Every structure is written in structure tokens, then in C-alpha cells.
Amino acid sequence: EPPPMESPFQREDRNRFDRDRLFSVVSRGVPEELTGLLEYLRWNSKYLTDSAYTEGSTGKTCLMKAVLNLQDGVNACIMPLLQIDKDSGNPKLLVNAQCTDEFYQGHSALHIAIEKRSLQCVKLLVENGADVHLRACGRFFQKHQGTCFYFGELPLSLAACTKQWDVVTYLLENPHQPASLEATDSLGNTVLHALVMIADNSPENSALVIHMYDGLLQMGARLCPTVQLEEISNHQGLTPLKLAAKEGKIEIFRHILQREFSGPYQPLSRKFTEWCYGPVRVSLYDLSSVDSWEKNSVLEIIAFHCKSPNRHRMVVLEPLNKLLQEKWDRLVSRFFFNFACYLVYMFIFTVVAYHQFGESMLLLGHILILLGGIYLLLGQLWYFWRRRLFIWISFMDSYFEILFLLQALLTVLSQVLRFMETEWYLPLLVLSLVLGWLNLLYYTRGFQHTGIYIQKVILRDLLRFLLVYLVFLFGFAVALVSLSRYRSILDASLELFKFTIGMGELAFLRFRGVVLLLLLAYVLLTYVLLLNMLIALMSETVNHVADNSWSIWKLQKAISVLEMENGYWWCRRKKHREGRLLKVGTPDERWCFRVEEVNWAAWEKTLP
Amino acid sequence: EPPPMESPFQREDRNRFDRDRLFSVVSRGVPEELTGLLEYLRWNSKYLTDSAYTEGSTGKTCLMKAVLNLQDGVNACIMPLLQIDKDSGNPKLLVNAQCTDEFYQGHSALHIAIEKRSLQCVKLLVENGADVHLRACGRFFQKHQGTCFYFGELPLSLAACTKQWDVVTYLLENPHQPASLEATDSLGNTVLHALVMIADNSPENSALVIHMYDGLLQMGARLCPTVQLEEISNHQGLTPLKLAAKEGKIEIFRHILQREFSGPYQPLSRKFTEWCYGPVRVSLYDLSSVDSWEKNSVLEIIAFHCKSPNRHRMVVLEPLNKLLQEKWDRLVSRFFFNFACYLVYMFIFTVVAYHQFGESMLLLGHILILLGGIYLLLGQLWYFWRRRLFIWISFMDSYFEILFLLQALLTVLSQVLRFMETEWYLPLLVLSLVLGWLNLLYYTRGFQHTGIYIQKVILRDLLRFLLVYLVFLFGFAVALVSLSRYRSILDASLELFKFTIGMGELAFLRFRGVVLLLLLAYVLLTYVLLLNMLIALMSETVNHVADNSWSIWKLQKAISVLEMENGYWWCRRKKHREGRLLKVGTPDERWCFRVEEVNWAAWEKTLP
Numbered sequence A, B: 001e002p003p004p005m006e007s008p009f010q011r012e013d014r015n016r017f018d019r020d021r022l023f024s025v026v027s028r029g030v031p032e033e034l035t036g037l038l039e040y041l042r043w044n045s046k047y048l049t050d051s052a053y054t055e056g057s058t059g060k061t062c063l064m065k066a067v068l069n070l071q072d073g074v075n076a077c078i079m080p081l082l083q084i085d086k087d088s089g090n091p092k093l094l095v096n097a098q099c100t101d102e103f104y105q106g107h108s109a110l111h112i113a114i115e116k117r118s119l120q121c122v123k124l125l126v127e128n129g130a131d132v133h134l135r136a137c138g139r140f141f142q143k144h145q146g147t148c149f150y151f152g153e154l155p156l157s158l159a160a161c162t163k164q165w166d167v168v169t170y171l172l173e174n175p176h177q178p179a180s181l182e183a184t185d186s187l188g189n190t191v192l193h194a195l196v197m198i199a200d201n202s203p204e205n206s207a208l209v210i211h212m213y214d215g216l217l218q219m220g221a222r223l224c225p226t227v228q229l230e231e232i233s234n235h236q237g238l239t240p241l242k243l244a245a246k247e248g249k250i251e252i253f254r255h256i257l258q259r260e261f262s263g264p265y266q267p268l269s270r271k272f273t274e275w276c277y278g279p280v281r282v283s284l285y286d287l288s289s290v291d292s293w294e295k296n297s298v299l300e301i302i303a304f305h306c307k308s309p310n311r312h313r314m315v316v317l318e319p320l321n322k323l324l325q326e327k328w329d330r331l332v333s334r335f336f337f338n339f340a341c342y343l344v345y346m347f348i349f350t351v352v353a354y355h356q357f358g359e360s361m362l363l364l365g366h367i368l369i370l371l372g373g374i375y376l377l378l379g380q381l382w383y384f385w386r387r388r389l390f391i392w393i394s395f396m397d398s399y400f401e402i403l404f405l406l407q408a409l410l411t412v413l414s415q416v417l418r419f420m421e422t423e424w425y426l427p428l429l430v431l432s433l434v435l436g437w438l439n440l441l442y443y444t445r446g447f448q449h450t451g452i453y454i455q456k457v458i459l460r461d462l463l464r465f466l467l468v469y470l471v472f473l474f475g476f477a478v479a480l481v482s483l484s485r486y487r488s489i490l491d492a493s494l495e496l497f498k499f500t501i502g503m504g505e506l507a508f509l510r511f512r513g514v515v516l517l518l519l520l521a522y523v524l525l526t527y528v529l530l531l532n533m534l535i536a537l538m539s540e541t542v543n544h545v546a547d548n549s550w551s552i553w554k555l556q557k558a559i560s561v562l563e564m565e566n567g568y569w570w571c572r573r574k575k576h577r578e579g580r581l582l583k584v585g586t587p588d589e590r591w592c593f594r595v596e597e598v599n600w601a602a603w604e605k606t607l608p
């Protein structure tokens, strides 16, 4: 149980001028009651930073108590208190004191002064030696589930996240101690990473994050021109663009990708207008950390490292849409070659399963099946060894890989069982047959007519529905079997399930009426449960949700393209860089991608 | 890869005053750096239009580069550059230079000056000899799929499509070279055709197209009164009204049909108010190119030449609604006579099929069936030979014609098989029987009670559903047959399909549990697929779409009427002209149709 940061109704725990009198004096704003505190500390060789003058559980000092009780942004005890601190000859400054609790670790008085929105307190603390790089690494300042406020752990990041431009300006340009825009917290996050991480998809917050990000970029260009603030990576290796891509923060993501400035801040732009003709606008976009020719690119992060539901809305933005379209058009022939090879392998496997000189052809077909199963096994194992996180974070768009792996495993295990002359090779062969013929439907995503053409529901409510239904099934099965001693529990469950799915009838002997009552109860309960499932499926459709199947199709195609670009396991494909190296101003050479857009509606609004 | 029209970041390809220095001078707006260019061209016998001074891939000249880099609508290098062109004695004028690339063919500097919305540049180019009839026929200026801007290929059409009335006025009335409103592009399209072709159904764009169309009609009446601008046909034989009808541009279509002016522009009207009494308003509408007594009329184009989904919304406008109603009321007796003849032919065919002196009556019935089949065959073949495009562009409202043709073909082929004494005549006879009795439902469109009473879905998702379902069926069938060696693949597919549609049961032998598992998997997968189809059918209905079955009924009746007006194949019907010849002002005699409307809501708003 963390204690409150400031409580008007609870005294601080402890786990002549004492702590209680000092706290009561600094909480009312009268400095004249501080007379005699310095002499007591000098006589007792005491300091106003030790455990006796601070809260025992946290370490909150009298300075922090004074800043927590501001009166119109100013407290009259802060300067006298720091004067007593200076005159006492304290080796450790009171202005740079931090709490030691695991909940408020690193929290200082400058953080409180910034949070209370008082430029006077911040100015007064900086002049007396406040460190502007003190990191608040407690659990209250980390982003997790519960009561927390993550802002980047830094005073400058706290000022930027709270919309205080005057505080940011004073922290960046002061004669005493300039704050650094390149400063990082415990996670390696800069102020731009912090602005990305506090961003949700709400419009007001998006406008806030965009404004603060643009202003900090401009002031960084004005103050530290030689360094690139957007090229700094945190401990996960992510730039703010990559961090926006991973966390699904769509608005700051589209703002960073399509950032255009006119005038002195033109080098800070990532989109450069090339030429306009009527409703045709042709622009050049920066491909820095966007093109997949580097590792850990934005495309790779969106496809295989993000878990947000905004992924399909992220691949339809420019320049990502045209880039993925060009990559797909480059890889159309490779996709359908794989489809044709898989179709031939299914055809051979089907012929061999149907026909289970003729002996030689059958052996050749069997060894072709074995080699194809080994190839599909090693290909899927390579995919899982590379991308074990992708299946975990998003099962809804990667279950075909598990199906291919299962089909390859069943094929190989059926063939080795056949070589050992076990008769059970045929069931596994026909299971591989049906599984591969189902797996042929993966390649329907190559066409728009078939790729766009309940999956979210059956991955979400299937386990709960199964729980309720097998509770019903097991109870009625044990009731029917124990009344018939229907021979075994599995037989009764099978009969009830086959009747429920319409595959068979019900067998109706003493106590026939009770058996009939049990059957009526089971049938009505299953009807109610299936009606519940049917209502749950009406719930998603009738609520008028816009059609996202096209963007989901482009996400599927992006995943397919980013897999085909690496080549096969046995032969790696050479990576080719997209865009061209062009100079966009002062020599600032960037790899740019040309995107041409036609928008009649936007153009006609500009027409006078 | 077409090069950019103007790139601030890429130099032009090439596939002392040179091209690079000249381009750099004309792109900054300083003419004083042009000193010495004329002497170099005179000494080298060079011209500023050759391949050495233009872009190699396109042919873009220095003049076009100068106009592409305007500064507040004016560039100070254009007049000195044209002065050097005049003094150099160039046989071909620089002001009339065009690009030669397949993407920008015919594109000149006047087009750029109009697109940049600079009256000063247009005036300066016209005074120095710019041709106002230069046609930009490149792929960027044709309407297709991709990056393009179609405007009519002409400078006047470009000015009209971009909402520049001052530019249109200057191009039409200037002392140097007057542009012609009768000028056509490569497709024969005038400026009115171009305004129709750039029209979509959005309200702002519709208001734009209406305003420009009306202004150009008024200025054409003021400038060239003796000619009719709306009577000009392009290379497809379409007037702007017919082009609006074919392309489905509903707003400009209703504006052209119901155009009413008061005062001097009264001859430009197509709707003339005759008399008003309370909420009753009675008007006269022009029937020029609207009545079907001419060929290629608006009714013919809407019914059989348009593919837009706005066709049913086009036949409910005045005067088309009352015209089609009058034609239908004139052709009610002809429709039900055809229905009665077809009903009698079905009755005879049914009696003969049921009864497969009695021999003579059976032979007479058989030859009556044969003659009726020949008549229906030749009637449908005539329909297809006339209207092969109509079935292709709209299958949803013409499949009954294919069904009638199929029924006639099966009838004739069954009769010739019967004459050859092959026993297989009876299956084809009963197929013709059921097909004709289904085809009897075509005539339900004659009544409002039955004509208004999923078809879009089963013509759109049927192929995709069949693909997925026969993938399921074929895989489970080969798995079941290869596990039973269920005797053949077709037998197993038939059994599974019959169980799926409820027509039969499932036959359940070694490996019975694996057979059961395959059957469970197939049943659950088919349940999921049918549930997907059911959800897809909920999607259209619950989204609150307005009832368009009445307008779809009138479209069906319009198709029926426009077919009955031509008569039968053996006897052509005489065409009668609708409306009456009346003088509507200065002698301007038009064939007019009287339409009476009652609108209480519109009338009461005018009441003070």
C-alpha cells in the first residue's frame, strides 16, 4: 500500500524543530516560523535531508512538501528552506533529493513544480541547482496496468507531455543548466518516444502530440542542428516512427510519415511535393527505416511485431500502400509459381492416395510425397524459428502456417509409418489429403475477386461455447448411461453430438419416460445455446461497421510479400532497395519514393 | 516510367548556353541572365526547340519549364525567351511546341498557363501566337485507370473544367485568335461532352458542371447563335445528353432534361411551363433525341447501353416517367397477348409430355411444340444478334432471355432426337417443361402487385462460394474414397452434397472412427460456410437501404416496352412519334410532351 503523495487528511508515516513542525510550517506558506531551524541543525550536526526529516516509507523531503502545497504557483518557504540548506553545509543538495520508495523512485521537487504548472517554482529551483535530468523510475511513473502516469521519467518530458511550452523553453534555454533533448530515461525513450507512448487515437490527444512533436523538432533544429532526434533508438532498437508503428498509434504515425513543412523547417519534412496538375498531386516520401531492405523496418514491425487492431489501417497509408503494391506486383509471378507447385504436389498426392510399371510409379509417387513433406516441414520450421512471436500476437492471420506445418508433419509421419508397414498409415495419409486440399485456400488472397471473400468470433467465443456445451453433454451423457446400466460415456456423448449436428438420431427398457425427459431437456438446452451463438453472430453484423476487408486483404498481401522477399530457406533472395537517392535540400540525400495521387474532392475545394 | 512534369529534386534526362543553364535561368525568374543566348543560337545555327534544348524523353521546352515555375502568376523570362525565339528566325514557333512522349503527347505551355490559373500568362502567350486548339492526347490526359486528368484535351475545355471563367472569356473573345466552342478532341468530345465526362454524382461537382454548362450554353448563344452546341455528336454518335445517359451521370442528366430559363435564354430551355393551378404544375418537355422513334435515343441508351447502377434512377425522371407510362399503357394488350400465347403453348406442351384419334392428336401436339420451339428460337436469336452487349453489361435484368433461348434450344433438340427415335428425348422434354414453367414467371412484371415481388448476391458471391465449397467437397470426397478402398469420387461428392442440402443421410469397415472424424469436420466446415453466407445476406438488408424495387420495376417495364415497340421478328411494328410539334418561340418548332405534376409540399412553401 503506497502512501499518498500529498494528503490533507493523513499524516506521513515514520517507518525543537522536528519533521512534523517543519512540514506544518512549509504547508502554510509562512517563512517567518523557520527561525531557529538552522541553529538546531548546526548544533545537532543534522541536515534537512536525513531520515528523521523525511517520510520513512518514501523519502519525501520538506522541499517536496512545500512544492506540493503551492499558493497561486508560489510558496514563500522554498527560498528560505534552500537558504538554510546552503548555510547548513549539506554535502548532498536538498534540491536534488529523490524519493526511495519503489512506487515514487526518483521523484523530485522539480517534477512537482512542473506538474503544478508553476514557472516561478521551476525557475527558482533551477537557479539553486536543480538537476534537469533526474529520472523518476518508480512504478507510478512506468506505464503498466493500474494507477500510473508515464511521461518519460524526465522533467523535460514531463513538461512536454503536460502542454507547458514556457517550461520546455526555460528548461532548454537557461544560463544555469540546459536540459538535453537527447536525454533518455530507463527505457532509452527520448521526449519524442515519450510523446509517442502517451498517444492514443483520440483527436484532441492526437492534436496535442502532433503539436508538441513538431515544436520540439523545430526547437531541436534551432538548438542542436547537427544531430537527428528522430534517429535515436531506445533499448528495444526503435525510433519514434518505429515505436508508433509497434504500439499502433495511427495518428502520430501518419503525421510522421507524411510530414511536410514549408520554409526554414523544410529539412524536417518526410514528404516533399513534386508537382501538381489539377486533381493530380505527385510527391516524394522519405523511405528511411520504412523500406524492408533494412532489418526491423516499419513494414516488418507492422506485419510481424504489432498486436494492435490498427495494423490493417496502417498499411493503407502513403507511402506504404504504393510501396506494398509495387512489391506485390514485383512478386506476383513468385506467388503463383508457389501456388502451381503446391497444386502439382496435391495432384500427385491425391493420385497416390487414390491408387493405394504400376509399382515403380507408385514408389516414385511415394518418394515424391516424402520429399515434398520434408520440404514443407523444413520451410515451416524455419518460419516458426524466425517468427515465433507473430503466431502468438496474432493467430487470426497466421493459422495457415500452422496448418501447413501440421500437414507436413502428418505427411512425413504417415510415410515413415508406411515404411514400417504399420496399417495406420492410411488414416494419416487421408488426413494429410484433406488438410492439404483445405490449405489450397491460402492462395485465394492473390486475387481481389477471391482474397476479400465469423473468424474473429470463432477464435474468441469457441472455448467458452465449448465449456458450456461439453458441460451439458457430459452431464446428460452420464445421466443417460447411469440410467441404462447407451453403454459408455463416450458413446452417449457421440450419439448426442451427432443428433445435435444432424448426423444421426436418438435411441430411446425401464424408465423410458425419464430418458425422454432427459432428451427433451438436452435438446431444449442445446437449442437455447445455439440460439445464443446465433444472436452473438447477429451482434457484430447489424451494428453497421464499415467494410475493412479490403484493408485486411492488403495486410494479408503485405505479410505474403514480406515473406517472399526473404526468398526460400534453401535459396535466399537478394534484397533490392526501393526508391532513388535524391537531394532534397541542404547535401541532404535521401532515398525517396514517388507517389501519385488523384483526389477530385480535395482539389475542387481549393477552386475559387 | 514517365518522368515528372516538374521536379524540384530531379534533373531532366537527356535520352556556352546549354539546356541546363537555360533551365536554371528560366526557373528563377531573372531574364538578365539570358544575355548571349541569342548570339550563341545565331552562331551555331541552333534553335531553342531542338532535341538539345529540350528534355529527351518528353520534349519539354524551356518555355514550358518557365511556365511550370511561375511566381505569383507571372514569370519575367517568358517574354524575353519568346523574343529570342522570334529574333532567331525559328520556322516552328516555340509557343506552339508540344511534348512527344506517349504520356504527355500534345501538352503545351498554354495548358500549363491555364492550369496554374494565370490570366497574365495566358494573355501573354496568346498575343505571341499560341494556338488555342492544341490537343493534349497523351495517356495522362485520357480517362483511364491510374494517374490521369481528362479534361477534353483542349485549352478551352481545360479552362472550363478548372472553373476559370475569365480564361474562358479571354479564349472565346480575343482579337488575336478566337477559340471555337465547336472544337473537338481526339474522341470527338466538345467542351460540353468534357463537362459531362468529368461529372460524378457528388453535389459540389454537380453544381460546378451545371454552372459551367449553363454559362457556356449562354455564351455560345451570344457568340454563335446559328449553331446548336448540344446537337454535336462525338465519334460514338453521342450528344452531351446521350453521353450523360450512357455514363450514368444522373445530376447533369436531370438538369439537361428539365432545363428551364426565363428571359433572353428561353430558347435554350428544354422544359417549358404551360400552366399552374394550386399544387398542379403542367409543363412541356422537349423530346429531341429522347423519344425512341429515332434510333440510339436516350431511352435505348439507358435501357440497353448503360452499365451504371443509376439506370433505375434515370427512368423515373420527367419526362421519361410519363413517356414510359404512356408507352406501357399503349402496349398493355400486346404484353398479355404474348403471355396468353405462351401460357397456351405451355398447356399444350404439358399435355403432350403427360400423354407420352389419340395418335393423330399426339402428332399434332408434337408438331405444334416443334413450331413453337422454332418460333422461340428465332425470336431469341434475333434478340441476341441485336443486343449482344446488353446481356454482357447487365446480366441481372436479362437472364430470362437466356432462359427462353435455352428452353427453345432444348425443345427443338428434344424433338429432333424424338424423330431419330433416340430414347433420350424424354429427359430433354421434361427439362424443357420445367424450364418453360419457370419462364412463365417473366410475365409477373405486368402487375404492380407481382412485378415488385438476393439476386444481386447470387450473381456476385456464387462463384466464390462454389470455389470454397467444392474445395471442401473434393477434399473430403477423395479422403473418404481413398479410406474406403464410397466407391467413386462423384458418388462420395453426391452423398455429401445430398446430406448438406438435406436430401439424404451419411453412410458410416476398418477405420470407422477416422471416417466419423472426417464427417464431423466436413459438417462443421459446411455449417461455418453456410453461416458465412447467411451473415453476408444479413449485411445488405439490415443496413437500412431505401426501397428501389419500384424504380427497378419501371426499368424492367421500360426494357419490355422498348422491346415490344420494335414488333416481332416476322412483323415489324410501325413506329409512332410521341408528343406534338409546337412552336416554343423564335420559328423554333419542337416535338413537346405534356407532363402534369401534383406537388402539395412544394406548393405550400411558396404560400406566404
Ligand SMILES: CCCCCCCCCC(=O)OC[C@H](COP(=O)([O-])OCCN)OC(=O)CCCCCCCCC
Binding pocket: A337, A338, A339, A341, A342, A343, A344, A345, A371, A372, A375, A376, A379, A400, A401, A404, A442
Ligand atoms: C521436392 C521439392 C524440392 C524443391 C524443388 C523446388 C520446389 C519449388 C519451390 C517452391 O516454389 O515452393 C513451392 C511451395 C511453397 O510454399 P509457400 O511457402 O508459398 O506456402 C506457405 C503458406 N504459408 O511449396 C511446395 O508446394 C512444396 C512442393 C514440393 C514439390 C514441388 C513440385 C514442383 C517442383 C518445381
Ligand SMILES: CCCCCCCCCC(=O)OC[C@H](COP(=O)([O-])OCCN)OC(=O)CCCCCCCCC
Binding pocket: A396, A397, A398, A399, A400, A403, A438, A439, A441, A445, A451, A453, A455, B468, B521, B525, B528, B529, B532
Ligand atoms: C483443424 C483443421 C480444420 C480447420 C481448418 C480449416 C482449413 C482452413 C480453411 C479456412 O479457414 O478457410 C479459408 C477461408 C479464407 O481464409 P482467409 O482469407 O480469412 O485468410 C486466413 C487468415 N485470416 O476462410 C473461409 O472461407 C471462411 C471459413 C473458415 C473455415 C473455419 C475457420 C477455420 C479456422 C482454423
Ligand SMILES: CCCCCCCCCC(=O)OC[C@H](COP(=O)([O-])OCCN)OC(=O)CCCCCCCCC
Binding pocket: B337, B338, B339, B341, B342, B343, B344, B345, B371, B372, B375, B376, B379, B400, B401, B404, B442
Ligand atoms: C407457331 C406460332 C407461329 C406464330 C403465330 C403467332 C404466335 C403469336 C406471336 C406472339 O404473340 O408471341 C407469343 C410469345 C412471345 O414471347 P415474348 O417475346 O413476349 O417473350 C420474351 C421474353 N423474354 O411467344 C410464344 O409464346 C410462342 C408460342 C407459339 C405458339 C403460339 C400459340 C398461339 C398462336 C396465336
Ligand SMILES: CCCCCCCCCC(=O)OC[C@H](COP(=O)([O-])OCCN)OC(=O)CCCCCCCCC
Binding pocket: B396, B397, B398, B399, B400, B403, B438, B439, B441, B445, B451, B453, B455
Ligand atoms: C438454371 C435454371 C434454373 C434457374 C433459373 C430459374 C428460372 C427463373 C425463376 C426466377 O428467377 O424467379 C423469377 C422471380 C422474379 O424475377 P425478376 O422480377 O427479378 O426479373 C428478372 C430480372 N431480375 O424472382 C424470384 O422470385 C426470386 C427467386 C429467383 C430464383 C433464383 C434466381 C435464378 C437466377 C437465374
